[PDB]
Design a protein around this nucleic acid. Structure first.
Lengths: 129, 23, 71, 129, 208, 83, 218, 98
RNA sequence: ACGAUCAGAUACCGUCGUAGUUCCGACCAUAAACGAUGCCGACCGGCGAUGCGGCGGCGUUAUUCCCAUGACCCGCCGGGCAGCUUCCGGGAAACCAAAGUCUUUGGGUUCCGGGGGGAGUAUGGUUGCAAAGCUGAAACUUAAAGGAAUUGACGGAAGGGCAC
RNA sequence: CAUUGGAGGGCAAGUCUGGUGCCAGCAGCCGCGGUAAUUCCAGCUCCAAUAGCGUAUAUUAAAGUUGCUGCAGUUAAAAAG
């Protein structure tokens, strides 16, 4: 079956981004990729965006900006034991000056700095730059 | 040519098969 | 194929073991044939008894007749 | 009879028909005795061929706008012709028919002009397949 | 461009725009021209937007006037269909003309005779100047070009939407572009209609 | 930039291209920061101010540059006409 | 003695422009050597890498010509490469010298993660490619020196890149495209986009536009 | 490596294709691989029909032609000069014998 | 098998010709079973041409037809069959809109290669009447085998000027 | 009186000399010795650690030549018809 709209978002945005279109429309969506959109906004990589309502999939239009390089999707879905967090930081994302790996865990959505600040780790799903 | 290398191997395999089955 | 699920170890580790069975650096040290057919049982020395002394040919590019002993 | 001629005369002609042209002859004998004074070469072999090709040049000079030489007469006359008197052509031509499609377009501009509504509507099957 | 309706849409342009045939480009379309059309016939041709035409044409004038000191910009073709127009545009503008025959390396080869240092490139047409357009992409000098529905449009920075096939339309374009550029320069304060008439820029086999 | 304590991230600011909201590299050739004259709009005459356009180099090959500077000029407000 | 030819270099002699900034804003084709041999007068620290002959086979004594790699650096952030093919080792050396003088590329520097002191390495984790060699560059703090083969060791220290980890996914034994890849990696430091970026510049008008005064002379 | 685009046969979206055999060669090749020309002519391959008209019952008759789907193999095409090779790009563009 | 061809022609080539080619029933399981290139899923430039269905109707054309409807006609859509060019990008290049969206390494998942040879061999099992198919090592000889592209010369490959 | 491995590149020193003439030897790789030998045997000289040096065989790293991080399957060995 069709799978992993998170991965499909992280592929469609990078499909259109190097082609330079100002906004983008993606057929499927989820509240959690919405949540990645919001984490992305708190750093400002993307701008504001619109959530086209069609109960069938839910489409998203989101603006692409020169604040971005790429964000990865990791299936299988691991867990950061809060020992391995620094390891994952140093071996996936290109910079400690920007970009901060993403975690779904028992304290809300978050990126790895804010995760370390609340002292709770969990699954890796995203890492951006 | 590899075709007749294989054919030489085939004939020699028949030789060895019969020489082993005889006794 | 190239699959990447999580609990896959029942496929992952056993297929990886089977696909390991191709390196020389695996065969030459993980099946009895290597030890049990090394020209000796394994030793930096090979003590023995000389039984004759002769010369060995070389190939004509570097033509030579070197001094070799049957031990 | 003859042979195809060389660079030492191609240059020796596209210099003299450039500068000495108006002072250059109209027939071979004249060309050669022009060469005697206003030519500097180590022989008469080059001189004879220069004179032959200058005979060629006058064959080609008054022969209409000619692309195989260049002279003042040509330079000025073409420039002077281009220096021209536009006849009464601001309207560019007389009465103009135009299409209802163009009229409906120029409705956006809220524009018209001297108009007759040229009708060319039905098509007979188009670009060859 | 501009918010002055006098530089903008006036009958002063249409009375000649419709005369030439400026509201028709060509049969087919490349995928980079949809910005400049409003209607389509039942007859196999696309009728361009003359308003957007004048819009980007006035932007072209803006570029031509941002030439702070005119001695240093090339107006080029190599096809006689616009050779006369480029000659008579450069003669009156001051920026240098090249037409008829080009030489690759003039403004690309470091060592060269007629080593010319332009600062803007004006081309009659991308289908007409293959090599100079590539060299304009080679050296950091912007590119201005006419644009048809048919035409390939690569490396075009300043676009002029119109058919560039025909002497009549292209002559209208040069003859009105000169007035527009000098207008936005300010030597023309809407005092006169310009006494040169478009027959001057409709290419001629010179027998006059 | 050069931060106060030396958080040195820029040796300088490279010319950023705004026509597509993307940054370019040091060795480019089609990232052209063209100038455009400003009008007086008492006669439409040129006057002494700059409307600038510097697109990322690579888009010229795609030939989107005309369209991008169309958008840039419309937004810049020296071009107001819209059908 | 010496004379400029092209307009930009002639200006550079006409020193009204002082820094390579008024160039690498615009990414100008700087078609003549002496621009940066004006920008510098000495301290042009070089290294003559190597000579590789390459020959074409004919019915007669086949025809061979030699290519000489050389590199230039200043241990500060200036670095470049010069690669020339010539009849003779001498002409190859001189061609490498001139090409390396023109090919200079300044680098955007930073730290291993510190925010104080003087920049010493790449800002982040990057990778440079060509040929078959993809060399992934990683910074390194104080006390970590140079971690490379001779080629990245040199073409980083001479790039002023003092402490560094190099990685290769390809064959470093291919020195030529190895050098080109490990120089492309340095060349691309301005490609990434950071929060320290993402503004709009002030468009410091072209050397041409601001200094037309001499530009209309010939 | 492949010095052809469709390898000299038009099998594109379809299974194995029929055989047909050369007649200057008597060799079997698949129909997509073969080369097919359609020749028409009169009986005498020159203007001898003028002589045929000179002594004829009717003046000259409407001349029923001969129509043939001429076949060659590739190698008989080479031997008998139907076409010849083309440049490493000029093989791409096409100009069959008229 | 017979005539020629040629030192050998047991061959090409020419003349006959059992088995084969043909049908039916059960075997036999192979190759250049070659797009040498899994499958499902999305996306990424255009059109010169294509095939069916649903579909917007200028002008054709046909039945007493406008309204049932065939060929048309300019076309939209859907996944289908494709060529052309384009730096979208990848690779070592040929090249391929896929052999792309890969270190800026991760949508899912069956087969599978680990230097050359030895070797698809022995050996054991298993189907086969058969020939063999699947399964599959080891000692041993080796620092080279291999592809991709440029230049020389070769060609009884062709297409073109010229020498007594 | 302190040596152990070298004196061709790879791999840190001699375009060293008498020989010897593909001859012994060196060369883990290339090749070097086929009289005008930088690989042999000696003299000086220099290279490398140093009371050490390798030799030889198990062990690791380099390794992304086991691909979990993190392989490749057109052509290179590779996709069941």
């Amino acid at each position: 079956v069709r799978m992993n709209v998170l991965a499909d978002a992280l592929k469609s945005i990078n499909n259109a981004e190097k082609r330079g279109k100002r906004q983008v429309l993606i057929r499927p969506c989820s509240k959690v990729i919405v949540r990645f959109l919001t984490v992305m906004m708190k750093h400002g990589y993307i701008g504001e965006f619109e959530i086209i309502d069609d109960h069938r999939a839910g489409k998203i239009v989101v603006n692409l900006t020169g604040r971005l390089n790429k964000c990865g999707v990791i299936s299988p879905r691991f867990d950061v034991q809060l020992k391995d967090l620094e390891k994952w930081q140093n071996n996936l994302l290109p910079s400690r000056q920007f970009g901060f790996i993403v975690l779904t865990t028992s304290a809300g959505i978050m990126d790895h700095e804010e995760a370390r600040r609340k002292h709770t780790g969990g699954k890796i799903l995203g890492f951006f730059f | 040519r590899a075709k007749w290398r294989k054919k030489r191997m085939r004939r020699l395999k028949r030789k060895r098969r019969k020489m082993r089955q005889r006794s | 194929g190239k699959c990447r699920g999580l609990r896959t170890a029942r496929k992952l580790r056993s297929h990886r073991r089977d696909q390991k069975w191709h390196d020389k650096q695996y065969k030459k040290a993980h099946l009895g044939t290597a030890l049990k057919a090394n020209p000796f049982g394994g030793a930096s020395h090979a003590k023995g008894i000389v039984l004759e002394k002769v010369g060995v040919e070389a190939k004509q590019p570097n033509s030579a007749i070197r001094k070799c002993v049957r031990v | 009879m003859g042979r195809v001629r060389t660079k030492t005369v191609k240059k020796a002609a596209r210099v003299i028909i450039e500068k000495y042209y108006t002072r250059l002859g109209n027939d071979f004998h004249t060309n050669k005795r022009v060469c005697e004074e206003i030519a500097i070469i180590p022989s008469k072999k080059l001189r004879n061929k220069i004179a032959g090709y200058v005979t060629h040049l006058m064959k080609r000079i008054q022969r209409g706008p000619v692309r195989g030489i260049s002279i003042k007469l040509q330079e000025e006359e073409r420039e002077r012709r281009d220096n021209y008197v536009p006849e009464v052509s601001a309207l560019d031509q007389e009465i103009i028919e135009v299409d209802p499609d163009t009229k409906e377009m120029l409705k956006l501009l809220d524009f018209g002009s001297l108009s007759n509504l040229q009708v060319t509507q039905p098509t007979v099957g188009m670009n060859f397949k | 461009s501009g918010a002055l309706d006098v530089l903008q849409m006036k009958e002063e342009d249409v009375l000649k725009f419709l005369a030439a045939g400026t509201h028709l480009g060509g049969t087919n379309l490349d995928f980079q021209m949809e910005q400049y059309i409003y209607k389509r016939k039942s007859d196999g041709i696309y009728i361009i937007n003359l308003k957007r035409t004048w819009e980007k044409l006035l932007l072209a004038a803006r570029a031509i006037v941002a030439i702070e000191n005119p001695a240093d910009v090339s107006v080029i073709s190599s096809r006689n269909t616009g050779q006369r127009a480029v000659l008579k545009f450069a003669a009156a503008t001051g920026a240098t003309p090249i037409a008829g025959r080009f030489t690759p390396g003039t403004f690309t080869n470091q060592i060269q005779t007629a080593f010319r240092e332009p600062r803007l490139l004006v081309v009659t047409d991308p289908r007409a100047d293959h090599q100079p357009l590539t060299e304009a992409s080679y050296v950091n000098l912007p590119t201005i070009a006419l644009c048809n529905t048919d035409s390939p449009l690569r490396y075009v920075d300043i676009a002029i939407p119109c058919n560039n096939k025909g002497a009549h339309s292209v002559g209208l374009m040069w003859w009105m572009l000169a007035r527009e550029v000098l207008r936005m320069r300010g030597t023309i304060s809407r005092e006169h209609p310009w006494e040169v008439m478009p027959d001057l820029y409709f290419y001629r086999d010179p027998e006059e | 930039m050069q931060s106060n304590a030396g958080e040195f991230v820029d040796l300088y600011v490279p010319r950023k291209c705004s026509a597509s909201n993307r940054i370019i590299g040091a060795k480019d050739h089609a990232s052209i920061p063209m100038n455009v004259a400003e009008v007086d709009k008492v006669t439409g005459r040129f006057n002494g101010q700059s409307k600038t356009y510097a697109i990322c180099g690579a888009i010229r090959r795609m030939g989107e540059s005309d369209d991008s500077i169309l958008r840039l000029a419309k937004s810049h407000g020296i071009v107001s006409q819209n059908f | 003695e010496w004379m400029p030819v092209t307009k930009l270099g002639r200006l550079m002699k006409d020193v009204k422009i002082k820094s390579l900034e008024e160039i690498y804003l615009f990414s100008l084709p700087i078609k003549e050597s002496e621009i940066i041999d004006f920008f510098l007068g000495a301290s042009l620290k070089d290294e003559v890498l190597k000579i590789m002959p390459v020959q074409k086979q004919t019915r007669a004594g086949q025809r061979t010509r030699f290519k000489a790699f050389v590199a230039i650096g200043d241990y500060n952030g200036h670095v470049g490469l010069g690669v020339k093919c010539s009849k003779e080792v001498a002409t190859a050396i001189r061609g490498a010298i001139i090409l390396a003088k023109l090919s200079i590329v300044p680098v955007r520097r930073g730290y291993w993660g510190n925010k104080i002191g003087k920049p010493h390495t790449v800002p982040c984790k990057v990778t440079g490619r060509c040929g078959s060699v993809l060399v992934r560059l990683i910074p390194a703090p104080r006390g970590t020196g140079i971690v490379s083969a001779p080629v990245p060791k040199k073409l980083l220290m001479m790039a002023g890149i003092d402490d560094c980890y190099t990685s290769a996914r390809g064959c470093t034994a291919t020195l030529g495209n190895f050098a080109k890849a490990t120089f492309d990696a340095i060349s691309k430091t301005y490609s990434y986009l950071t929060p320290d970026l993402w503004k709009e510049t002030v468009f410091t008008k072209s050397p041409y536009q601001e200094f037309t005064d001499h530009l209309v002379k010939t | 490596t492949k010095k052809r685009r469709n390898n000299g046969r038009a099998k594109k979206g379809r299974g194995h294709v029929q055989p047909i055999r050369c007649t200057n060669c008597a060799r079997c090749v698949p129909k997509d691989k073969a080369i097919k020309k359609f020749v028409i002519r009169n009986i005498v391959e020159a203007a001898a029909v003028r002589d045929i008209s000179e002594a004829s019952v009717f003046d000259a008759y409407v001349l029923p032609k001969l129509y043939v789907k001429l076949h060659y193999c590739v190698s008989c095409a080479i031997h008998s000069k139907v076409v010849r090779n083309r440049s490493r790009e000029a093989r791409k563009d096409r100009t069959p014998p008229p």
